[PDB]
């Protein structure tokens, strides 16, 4: 039954993440990162808000989203750079 | 031949910008302040297929005319200390005869050539450049405490003197900074010492130089003054209870938690008073926005730039980055904003315009001059000496910088989308893959250039320019 | 009309790694398409901040109601009525060369020829993407549909041009994308010693004084020119301005 | 109104009105032309209401006066306009423009016809930067310069053999060609020739060039030749300029077109034509041309030295008892070149080109039949105020900027009719049209003259020939000359002025004719202790005069 809504959401915070998740990358490393990721991002928090029983999807939902997928690309790096990446991005998981 | 119009040569003449380097941040450690002097002569003195050369025997010969011109200088003739001193004005002046653009052109490379290198051996040792410049040089030191670079910055001074490059250099120490907040040469705000002294603490003397606070509110300059002294405060606190203690570093992590809550409440307190007397008709002198020469923003919310400004100055710690976010959030949630928003973005507040190597003939002092992020009362008059410059030179060098802009626009190249290569027909629609050509130089630069030269001639009376504008 | 997707060996591109073995496809198969499109993925930061920007805006809750204003500002039409009009077009149409634009045509393709055969002394492989006759046709082909779409019956320079200036972005994206592939290196290295020697930072020479200088020696002009026009894809100390003339060294 | 005027009732002179301008001729008659009827009516009270002809006769004038202004379906306020015109209906027609307000022209080559073009000062804003041009300007400059020159030789009666472009030449070999376009240098530094299809190289070793031109980079030339394909070399055998044409056949393709309109403009809407009032004003000028005289000076008179205030003040003395029409002075002004001035001790050169000026109002002040009788003319010469501040006395932007206002206000006040034009300037008279252009042409056209592998009237003859068979002010590239990407139509002999002031200081004085084209070349003001002007007579007569 439950259909969430997406209206109020932070265009440019999801677009500068996106942005710097295209910087490094293949740039710097080897992971592939296209436009899928941000409907990936986009249904995640579609799908926790979801979670509530919610048609309308709030700003935890997006944070909580925007975290799993910075933390999935964080954890599949070397050992090298996991330290610098972890504390580079760490400006937008705030909370 | 040089009656004719050549590339090369228009390109060698107005090519008279001299770079520099800014390193903005937020410094603990002990900074020293330091001129040079005499860099030209030393430049010059020191060091068939290139077809822009200037002729090597006429600089060799020139280098021994200098070299017995400083020899005799040093036995006590004060004629040949003047002729040393106005050397450089000769080489700039073109009035003067045998004068060559070329050789000019010459002697500024080598001089920034000069600049880099001595840039490139004050890092070889534990430095941090800062601010370089003609003039002025800031290097960080690695030490903490004043007392304890006495013989480290005589060494420095020492072995830079004894350099074969450097010999004929004159290096001045000034200021000694203890806490340093550095972002712009026009804006900065710290504790400073003149000279250390020994067996004494030295005398610790707070500066503040910000042409941004000209931009706010007249009602709210009380209050940025008031806390950016406080935040001053509490950071000098902490750095010292570190040092009693003992890319992060404690020194100032931790300096947030003194003030957060008093500065909750006070923009509480002010938002609400604004909001309470912004439409009133007798309280609307105060909420006035200044204009000044080079303002291009317009923002209506004053509170709202406060906040940013003094969240900008605070962001620049870039050690403590996410607590300023946090406090910048949470200030940002008594307004109805968000975290990322674009209207929640600081901006400079002013644009620059800036002439090269302006002329003091009272002192053969020469220094770049901004017209518009400099305060008044320093325009007119020279840096070192205190004399009046004249008006009418202002205005035609304006005037010079504004056509050579224009030529410079006019005989421009032209560059393809794609790729990036340049044209190399006189005549052809577009590349020979996709893509068509446009301009090196933007047009809407040099639209932008001629509205902040309309704004310093309104600030200022400057009729000569305005005739010059309504010329076109 | 087959209109075909396909994805390249080893998934991107991997310009580093010669075209030769990136495509997998003979040339029999290849020489029957004649637009082929090289897709390749890029990274500036505005391109990925705008791309964000109109994915953002295509969520439903938004683009229903700009698209909606492109065909009430009548920009653009709506689906039906398009297949209306091209099903009109076709039936009804069918335009016609003239002599001037035959000499045009002639004349770009035997160009485009020579450019090949350039190539490939160099190379000394056969190209991956091959240029024929069938090209010919291809081009004359576009040129037709061109003058189709606005019903006229006969076909001019406007629509020539337009349809030259496809075929070359087509041309250029694939076939003679970086055809080296990457004397050997001995000269580049001994080159590079020289420019660095005898020309210093801020000053600048004349191209034709180099040439006749590294034709004089060894070099030879064959070497030289790929070896500048490398050095400017280094683009780290090797400047040009002023046409091709002005060699400046930033 | 009359002696007697009487207040009318509008609706009682509605009928009146209506009638004939709504079912005669005319239409849409608005309430401020009612208002200006009643007036004129006020004016014409005599015996009115019950007055036919003559009320009715003037409202027909009133038709063919207004109808020649735009369209004429509306009539506002203007309505007293078009009274005081009945009222007055009841030398001038001559004109001095700059490059500054030239009219513009594109040209299609398809159409091959010429477009006018929409002024950017008349339509847009222009508050900030109005004045500067669109980057794909410079790009079509040299497409419309080659356009008109192809069009100048495929109109000649010759040729009707025909040309091949560059771009046909790639696969035939051994065979002779013929082909014209820029000529230039490669970057490769070869000789080449540039055509919008392509560019190819040129072989001179065996050249025989047509005399009496000079083959200058940047000049159309007609190439004859041998393509080979061995390599890519064209052996040229003989070059030559493309020939010229003079005024009437070049009108006449266009009909008689107002593009030094003064009696008549065209626009975007329209286009506009002429030729009956031609022959009225050709035959106004064969009458009383002798007394409508005008008189140029010699180049480069210098404000600072005191034998060329002498020297002037004579020459106003002779020239005070018999005004001319137009006085025309050309050449810089100052002998320095002015500039930044780096010393603050001495007078600024601002302030010394200002008093350079002053002083000239003074002068003038005891030649009251001059300065009330003649009009002025000033051209600027090389080092002026403006072009010398970033050329420093060298060559510079060829549509250069008149006299700032701040430098010149006191020959406005002191003298009744005075103008300041670019160095190109344009006069329209009433059957002439006559340019003036100062500069240095023969130091130009002799240093970068072409070297070909193998008694001073000759080389004014060859550059006479070269500059009209070109039919452009500056044949040279960007390189030498660089030019406003916009306003080089303004530098464009395509309408082919019936007389030319070629004022070159490097250059002897003469007066030669061609094509039919008369040029005149006044040389320095002042030479070997000598005082020269000289004076040119509209029936195609000179005179020559000094004073010592
Ligand atoms: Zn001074
Ligand atoms: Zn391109």
């Keep these: 039954k439950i259909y969430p809504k997406l209206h109020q959401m932070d265009m440019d915070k999801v677009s500068r993440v996106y942005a710097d998740l295209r910087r490094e990358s293949i740039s710097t490393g080897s992971f592939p990162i296209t436009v899928r990721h941000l409907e990936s991002i986009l249904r995640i928090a579609e799908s926790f808000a979801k979670m509530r029983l919610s048609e309308f999807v709030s700003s935890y939902d997006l944070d909580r989203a925007i975290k799993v997928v910075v933390d999935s690309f964080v954890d599949a790096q070397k050992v090298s750079v996991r330290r610098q990446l972890r504390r580079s991005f760490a400006i937008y998981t705030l909370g | 031949i040089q009656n004719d119009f050549d590339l090369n040569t228009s390109w060698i003449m107005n090519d008279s910008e001299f770079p520099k380097i800014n390193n903005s941040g937020v410094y603990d450690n002990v900074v020293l302040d330091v001129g040079v ?151 900065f705000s710290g504790l400073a010492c003149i000279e250390i002294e ?275 | ?165 496809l075929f070359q972005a087509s041309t250029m994206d694939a076939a003679s994308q970086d055809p080296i592939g990457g004397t050997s290196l001995s000269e580049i290295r001994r080159f590079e010693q020289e420019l660095k020697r005898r020309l210093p930072i801020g000053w600048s020479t004349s191209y034709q004084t180099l040439r006749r200088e590294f034709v004089d020696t060894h070099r030879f002009s064959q070497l030289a020119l790929d070896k500048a026009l490398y050095a400017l894809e280094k683009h780290e100390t090797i400047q040009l301005r002023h046409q091709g003339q002005n060699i400046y060294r930033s | 109104g ?72 509306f009539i506002d306020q203007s309505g007293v306009k078009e009274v005081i015109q009945e009222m007055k209906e009841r030398r001038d027609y001559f004109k001095v423009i700059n490059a500054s307000q030239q009219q513009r022209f594109s040209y299609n080559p398809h159409k091959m016809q010429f477009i006018f ?132 056949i070049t009108l006449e393709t266009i009909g008689n077109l107002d593009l030094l309109g003064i009696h008549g403009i065209s626009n975007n809407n329209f286009i506009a034509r002429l030729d009956k009032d031609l022959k009225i004003r050709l035959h106004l000028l064969e009458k009383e041309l002798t007394d409508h005289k005008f008189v140029i000076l010699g180049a480069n008179l210098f404000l600072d030295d005191l034998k060329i205030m002498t020297a002037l003040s004579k020459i106003l003395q002779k020239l005070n008892d018999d005004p001319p029409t137009l006085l025309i002075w050309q050449g810089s002004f100052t002998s320095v070149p002015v500039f930044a001035s780096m010393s603050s001790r001495n007078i600024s050169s601002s302030t010394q080109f200002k008093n350079n000026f002053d002083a000239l109002a003074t002068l003038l002040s005891r030649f009251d039949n001059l300065t009330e009788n003649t009009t002025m003319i000033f051209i600027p010469g090389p080092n002026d105020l403006w072009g010398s501040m970033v050329s420093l006395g060298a060559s510079g932007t060829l549509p250069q900027d008149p006299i700032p206002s701040a430098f010149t206000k006191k020959i406005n006040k002191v003298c009744k009719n005075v103008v300041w034009s670019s160095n190109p300037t344009r006069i329209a008279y009433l059957s002439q049209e006559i340019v003036i252009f100062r500069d240095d042409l023969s130091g130009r056209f002799k240093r970068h003259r072409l070297e070909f592998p193998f008694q001073k009237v000759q080389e004014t003859r060859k550059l006479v020939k070269t500059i009209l068979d070109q039919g452009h002010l500056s044949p040279f590239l960007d390189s030498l000359r660089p030019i406003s990407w916009d306003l080089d139509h303004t530098l464009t002999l395509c309408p082919i002025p019936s007389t030319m002031v070629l004022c070159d200081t490097t250059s002897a004085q003469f007066d030669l004719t061609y094509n039919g084209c008369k040029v005149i070349n006044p040389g320095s003001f002042i030479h070997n202790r000598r005082a020269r002007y000289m004076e040119y007579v509209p029936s195609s007569k000179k005179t020559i005069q000094e004073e010592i």
């Design chain 3, 1 to 165: 009309s087959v209109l075909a997707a396909a994805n390249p060996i080893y998934g991107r591109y991997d310009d580093l790694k010669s075209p030769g073995d990136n495509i997998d496809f003979q040339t029999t198969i290849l020489s029957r398409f004649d637009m082929i499109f090289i897709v390749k993925d890029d990274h500036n930061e505005e391109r990925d901040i705008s791309i964000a920007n109109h994915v953002i805006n295509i969520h439903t809750g938004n683009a229903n109601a700009m698209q909606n204003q492109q065909e009430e500002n009548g920009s653009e039409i709506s689906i039906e009525k398009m297949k209306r009009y091209i099903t009109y077009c076709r039936l009804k149409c069918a335009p016609r060369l003239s002599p001037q634009a035959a000499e045009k045509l002639s004349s770009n393709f035997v160009t485009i020829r020579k450019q090949l055969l350039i190539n490939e002394l160099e190379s000394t492989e056969r190209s991956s993407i091959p240029i024929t006759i069938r090209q010919l046709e291809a081009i004359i082909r576009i040129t037709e549909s061109l003058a189709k779409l606005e019903l006229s019956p006969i076909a001019q320079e406007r629509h020539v041009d337009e349809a030259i200036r």
């Design chain 2, 37 to 187: 002097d005499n860099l030209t002569v030393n430049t010059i003195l020191t060091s068939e297929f290139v077809h822009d050369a200037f002729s090597n025997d006429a600089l060799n010969v020139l280098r021994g005319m200098l070299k017995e011109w400083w020899d005799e200088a040093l036995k006590e003739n004060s004629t040949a200390d003047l002729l040393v001193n106005s050397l450089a004005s000769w080489v700039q002046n073109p009035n003067a005869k045998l004068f060559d653009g070329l050789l000019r052109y010459h002697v500024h490379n080598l001089t920034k050539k000069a600049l880099l290198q001595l840039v490139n051996e004050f890092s070889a040792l534990g430095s941090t450049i800062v601010y370089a410049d003609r003039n002025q040089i800031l290097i960080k030191t690695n030490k903490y405490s004043p007392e304890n670079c006495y013989a480290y910055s005589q060494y420095m001074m020492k072995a830079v003197r004894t350099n074969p490059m450097f010999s004929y250099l004159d290096l001045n120490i000034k200021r000694y900074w203890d806490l340093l907040i550095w972002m712009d040469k026009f804006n």
């Design chain 2, 198 to 472: 020994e067996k004494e603490n030295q005398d610790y003397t707070a500066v503040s130089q910000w042409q941004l606070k000209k931009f706010l509110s007249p009602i709210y300059q009380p209050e940025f003054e008031d806390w950016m002294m406080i935040i001053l405060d509490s950071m000098l606190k902490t750095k010292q209870s570190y040092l009693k203690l003992n890319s992060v570093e404690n020194s100032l992590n931790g300096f947030s938690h003194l003030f957060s809550k008093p500065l909750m409440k006070r923009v509480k307190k002010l938002f609400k008073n604004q909001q309470e007397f912004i439409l009133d008709p007798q309280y609307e002198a105060d909420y006035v926005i200044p204009v000044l020469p080079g303002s291009h923003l317009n923002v209506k919310n004053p509170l709202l730039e406060l906040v940013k400004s003094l969240c900008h100055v605070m962001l620049l710690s870039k050690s403590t980055i996410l607590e300023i976010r946090t406090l910048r959030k949470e200030l940002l949630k008594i307004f109805e904003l968000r975290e990322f928003a674009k209207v929640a973005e600081f901006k400079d507040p002013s644009l620059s315009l800036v002439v090269p190597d302006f002329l003091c003939e009272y002192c053969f002092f020469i220094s770049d001059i901004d017209f518009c992020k400099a305060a008044p009362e320093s325009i007119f008059s020279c840096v070192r000496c205190h004399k009046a410059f004249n008006q009418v030179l202002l205005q035609e060098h304006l005037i010079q910088k504004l056509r050579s802009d224009i030529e410079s626009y006019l005989i421009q190249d032209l560059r393809c989308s794609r790729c990036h290569k340049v044209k190399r027909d006189y005549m052809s629609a577009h590349c020979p893959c996709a893509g068509a050509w446009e301009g090196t130089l933007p047009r809407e630069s040099i639209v932008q250039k001629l509205n902040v030269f309309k704004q310093v001639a309104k600030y200022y009376g400057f009729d000569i320019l305005l005739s010059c504008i309504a010329d076109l």
């Design chain 4, 117 to 248: 073009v929409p002024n950017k000062k008349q339509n847009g804003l222009g508050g900030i930067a109005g004045f500067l041009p669109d980057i794909e300007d410079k790009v079509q400059m040299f497409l419309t310069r080659y356009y008109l020159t192809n069009d100048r030789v495929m109109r000649n009666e010759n040729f009707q053999m025909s040309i091949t472009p560059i771009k046909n030449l790639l696969g035939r070999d051994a065979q002779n060609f013929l082909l014209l376009g820029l000529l230039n240098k490669n970057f490769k530094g070869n000789w080449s020739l540039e055509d919008p299809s392509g560019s190819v190289e040129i072989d001179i070793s065996q050249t025989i060039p047509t005399q009496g031109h000079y083959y200058v980079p940047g000049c159309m030339v007609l190439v004859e030749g041998i393509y080979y394909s061995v390599g890519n070399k064209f052996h040229v055998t003989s070059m030559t300029l493309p020939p010229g044409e003079r005024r009437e």
């Design chain 4, 2 to 73: 009359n002696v007697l005027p009487v207040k009318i009732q509008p609706p009682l002179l509605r009928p009146l009105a209506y009638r004939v301008l709504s079912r005669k001729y005319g239409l849409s008659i608005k309430s401020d032309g009612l208002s200006a009827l009643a007036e004129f009516v006020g004016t014409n009270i005599g015996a009115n209401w019950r007055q036919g002809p003559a009320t009715i006769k003037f409202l027909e004038q009133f038709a063919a006066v207004w109808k020649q202004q735009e369209r004429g379906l």
